[PDB]
Amino acid sequence: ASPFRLASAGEISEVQGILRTAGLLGPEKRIAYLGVLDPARGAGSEAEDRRFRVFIHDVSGARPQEVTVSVTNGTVISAVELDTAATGELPVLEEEFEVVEQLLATDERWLKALAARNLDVSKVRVAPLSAGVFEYAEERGRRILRGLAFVQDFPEDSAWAHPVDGLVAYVDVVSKEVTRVIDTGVFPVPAEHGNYTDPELTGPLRTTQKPISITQPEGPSFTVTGGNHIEWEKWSLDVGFDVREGVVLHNIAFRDGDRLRPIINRASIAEMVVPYGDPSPIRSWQNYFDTGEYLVGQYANSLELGCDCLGDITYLSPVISDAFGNPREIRNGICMHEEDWGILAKHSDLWSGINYTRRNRRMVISFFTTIGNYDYGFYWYLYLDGTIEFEAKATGVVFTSAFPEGGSDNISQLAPGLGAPFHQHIFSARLDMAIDGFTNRVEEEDVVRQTMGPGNERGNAFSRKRTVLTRESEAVREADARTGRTWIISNPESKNRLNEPVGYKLHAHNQPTLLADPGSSIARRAAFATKDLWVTRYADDERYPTGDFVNQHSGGAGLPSYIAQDRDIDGQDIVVWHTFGLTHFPRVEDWPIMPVDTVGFKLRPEGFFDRSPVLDVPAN
Template sequence: MFLQLALAAFVVAAASVTPLPDAPAPAAAETPPPCGSDHRVDQTLTNGARWQMCWEMRTIEGLTLSRVTYTPKGGVPVSVLRSAALAQIHVPYDSGEPRYHDIGSLGSAVIPLTDGDCPGGERRLDQVCVTTRPRGHAYLKDGFGDPGQRRSLQGRELVMLSAYQVGWYAYVAEFVFGDDGSITPRVGATGSLAGTTTSPEYGWPIGVGRKHFEESHSHNVFWRLDFDIQGKSRDVVEQYDFPGNKTKKRTLEKTVLTRETAARSRPTRWWRVVDPEVRNTDRHPVSWEINNTDTAQYRGPADERFTRADLYVTQYKACERLATYNAEPRCAESVDRYTDGEKVRDPVVWVNVGFHHVPRDEDADPMPVHWQGFRITPRDVTATNPYRAE
């Protein structure tokens, strides 16, 4: 693994769209996203849900999505994200060294994709795979003895995939868009183990006997998500907690994050980005929920304070691009320093997901993929089941 810091300035233009009406209106998605055909994605899934977006391969962050819009079946387009990209892959080893920051020039580390990497899909410039695949049950309801009342449906998802060779690791990066309106960013690490030898205190025996101990390490993956729910002017980030451990009752506690914040994952804690003026036909505000419970919550030393939180909320600044080693001279170096209490009017959400990799014999070359990521779920975007919405 290596670190390259050859930053090039890039600013993503803000989307400008109008709020959803209170009653359904015809979908206005005939106007394509403002990008060339090679970089435009417009996919309608089998249940009628439609995803539209632009993509580009940035020198630093690699695959970057912009102008992401979701149209539920029978509904109107809802813009969700102005941009989404990886912001860092921090890899500290258990013995204390080395401590890699693997994002520096992912765009120049792209692994050219083959048809085998993109089954049933389309390779764009051999850099990105655009495909769809089954995602399991969308729902299942028993008919309680009446076969005519039984309901079951399989769901599908749109996948945007790219891969990068960083030292001995290959990273497979996916943005997965469900037919239920969900978004799942995730990264899979594969390729080869480092081949380093350490003591039993810091590793696991690999190979014959107990002569070689492969060192354990963490992968702390950061994503940068610039939410724009029908424009940037009203979006708010809220934190939800449900205290009541070891009691019969649980209460709901809402905290509005009006200023830049570093937040930590806890059981039953989640966040949402909401536009209070964009409402579904039940007149409930449209939002997207962020759940980051599948994280190892690595906490590093004082000079790695960026690892001390699992979600950061910051005010949009074009030069705040990476979670660490941000080399833009106009901005601070790491995401923990971006959160200085500034009032948030146009929120950017940074999500940190940790995975502690303890090697095993099964990781022999080529190493099977181990995945880490989080989930973004629509909350009140439609007033009914998105598979049955009309």
Template sequence: MAHSFKVFLFFSFFTLSIIPFSHQLQHPLDSLTPNEFIQVQSIVNRSYPGSSHNLTFQYVGLEEPNKQVVVSWLENSSTTPPPRQALVIARINHRTHEISVDLSSVGIISDRIYDGYGYPLLTFEEQTAANQLPFKYAPFLASISKRGLKIEEVVCGSFTVGWHGEEKKNRRIVKVMCYYLDGTVNLYMRPIEAITVTVDLEEMKIIHFQDRFMIPVPKAAGTDYRESEQRAPFGPQLKGITVMQPDGPSFTIDGNRVRWANWDFHLSFDARVGPIISLASIYDIERQKFRRVMYRGYLSELFVPYMDLTEEWYYRTFFDAGEYGYGLCAVPLEPLRDCPANAVFMGAFVAGQDGMPIEMPNVFCIFERNAGDVMWRHTETMIPETLVTEVRPEVSLVVRMVSTVGNYDYINDWEFKRIGSIKVTVGLTGLLEVRGSKYTHKDQINEEAYGTLLAENTLGARHDHFLTYYLDLDVDGDSNSFVKSKLKTTRVTDQSSPRKSYWKVVSETAKTESDAKIKLGLESADLLFVNPNKKTKMGNLVGYRLIPGSVTGPLLTDDDYSQVRAAFTKYNVWVTPYNRSEKWAGGLYTDQSRGDDTLATWSSRNRKIENKDIVLWYTLGFHHVPYQEDFPLMPTLSSGFELRPANFFEYNPVLKVKAPNNVKWLNCST
């Protein structure tokens, strides 16, 4: 939906000289710079001049360089770095073009027309344009007037339509749904129901209009969430609390490379997926070198199906990354609110519909987390006349980005720990999507209402969230295997022990992709990425372990159309051989996709995955039955997962961590 806050930078179209944007050498995985965006735009525009072409840039991003070339360059930086290339998905004269642009040779490498199912990411500009159309459309104005509503208090948003079995390929359309402000900014609590405006994005005109019935817009009294709008009594006000680092942070940022404690990684930004963590390596004190853990990790797709069959709701089965752009929807983080006082902020750039760079300030914050947790402790009381107490407080490093896709705000944390863990947490907050309804009390409801009555005329709609992460782990090198260490109940039948049972570990190495598909919750197992070519001194395969944080799976039937599109959510875990083209679990063209280009289809080839460069895909989910506490705002509900070393080190790195110096403050006054 339309973001109006974007600051457009007025880079000249013709200036291709390098702006002194960054003093350090460029890293092959750096996001495109403003100059590069301009360069790309200029190159594409040269081939398709605006005077004779209808050209929109739907996506512009770094074309991920060849992994082997990157790895070689890292090992020996005197070799030639991989060429800088950009991937452009454009609509040119109403057709989708996939254009590869080389930024060193300054030209188009390839230009392919895509004619299959599905469309590229929507741009903000076309959503904004679509949202304006109803205001000049007489039937819509009549509908608003008929309801006694003031048109100047109406705002509209564009909703992707999904696919629901239509045989004929649909045009590139959205449905525009509208809300009533009239004194509130919490528009999501005031849907104007029953009106559906269908917009053709290519023609940028309304092609269908429907107004089915009239029900009251919820009064939504008292639902404005702005602090400035609240009246007493207030909730308890807490005294000030903050984090202090008198000697500054313990991390360094060199371009896009972040170094903290024993970690070293690269952070970049992409319009489609948001933050990308690359080349995460951890320093091994014993071997005195950095060892690779993850080549690249990011949120690949986010599927949000609603469970409401009514005409205005059935199609709401969103793919937030592939349709709206999870990075495009990033919002500026508020210092001291979104991130603690010790946070450092970073911005990013995306391309506008015209291909020109748009600055997105403060999309990242990076901070050391000091939550009061304990990394390790022990009190030893068994040694006579000796009391040993050793405690190492936990401090970790967090990279945060918030993506606000319409009503939902997703707080994305990548957290690095000194024990070697990478922990990913997503917090769901923002506002609930509610349906206007005739009901004013639960007792009136005698049908399937698809939600919880939260307030008068306000039904909180049931829905799911499935977040699928792409995790190209390279555990101490890129040849890895996926091992399920199953915990098997074993009966003791030979009188060898007074025990009747125990559990043992039966490790199975997945040979092919089908061996690696897992629905969590069905059996007890440790899930490991190991390097079958490297062992600890004791002979254990070096590995990392996935510790899932959720066992949620889809409840739609396999043959339901949106589930076909989101077939990658059927299993919580998939493992695929690395393939540069397999990045987005829902396929490159997700809007109106039909499921012919998803993780599930790729994986159906059942390729070999043993001792190969392989990728872990992990899906965590939420089933959301709304409660009144989700009204009129939703407090954060979190889930996540952890990648934890498992026989990666000879011993735990915490052994060599000193307790921090106490912070002493003198002469402070407030």
């Protein structure tokens, strides 16, 4: 019954039928993106209109289309031809991954480059990398991927240990032509393998690790009804899944006594950018938007019990569409479990003689995705005390290059002759706020140091100041760790028993934002990543900080375009976009496969409750 249920196999089939019947899905067509649309503001219209948005690629070269279907009434609502030279190409198709390698295996420039290196073309793998927008005027309106090559000594060899430097090719995947091959020169191919399952590398495995058994003999404290509605320790929410964004949290709310109080209307990681800081022309174009360009949801892993998720695990298996409109199930694609989280509260009082201790717990919702050499885990946590936290776990295999003779300022050496360019992984959290409802405002809170003098005779005083962000034109904010800067999202029309607005505080990690020059191409296309915090007025079509079609878009779409409307945000339906990420200078310990590193953010209540919300937690 819930308009927020996961798409089913049946719904995607019905979308396939509707598109076919309408003549929109013939044999030369491909679904580049399919996803359910959220209900509009005001679901008072009884019975839901389950609508779906679709991007349809045309392999014969005709113009792509954006189509919206209503599977409830079984009709096409709208269909728009897209001009990709203006508004960006469609997301990369999975079936275009291999096209880059097979085209190059019969191009004479590529074979010439490999012959110069004594490389067997049947051992050379080519990574299908997104192209971006640079100084190649001929790439306008064309669907282009770029190729970087890695040698694979045998079918189970880790190709990342053998980068083929000085060589890159550009490929038109629709007309199937190799547009350019660039050969800046010969670099030795690093010969050491990086096979982390080879006993020569690993040595004998440890026998010292004894098991840890985490069980819940009575089962878990949460309940799933309606496929994806979660109730856990006063928390209530719906777990969605989008092939582009991955796991989406809807209707996050908290049962405060008898009233169900909204906190967040919709939470997602709406974009991901990985810019590389190597100035070598072989890689200076290299940036990936894994979310916008590749869609991280469609690369979700199946997570195995006792390996990926440990404990009493409840699984969800989301359904997505393949390139032809057939439903594809991602088995065990989402993990949900609760886990112990140490001491929640503790005091032993000298005067009353009472000793008090309570344990904390958190609810975990996670999925893991793989894009080429990179693996990323997305973790949402809910805590007993009302804290909401997001954590990204970055692992996998670092992207490699040759290590130049005589060193580099932008590459680190992991192995003889083997380099790993410097880069960042930068995320955009989109938080459609609904703190006790939709009348919200954002305040910037700074620590205030005070001077020794009258009224502060001992020089011990300090304070704070809050600055209300009133219009979008003033709501592009920078971190300031030195003054403890945080941001408070409050509802000015909902007060707690002390007559103050209820609120939640956003705690950032204050990592560096985008390091690229502000005149570069990537600063233009990843403009959200240049600032820590943006606030916009809610609007149905403003969904991604980079716009709808990120692939090969020239820049400026998304957030800097939304912000320019200078709308009123002081007590309105607002959206918070938080940029955060990792700056990765690769270390020897990241090789041949890298241990997890993390980054994220959290929100804690700030006078949302009338007292501590965990006074009713038992002792156990």
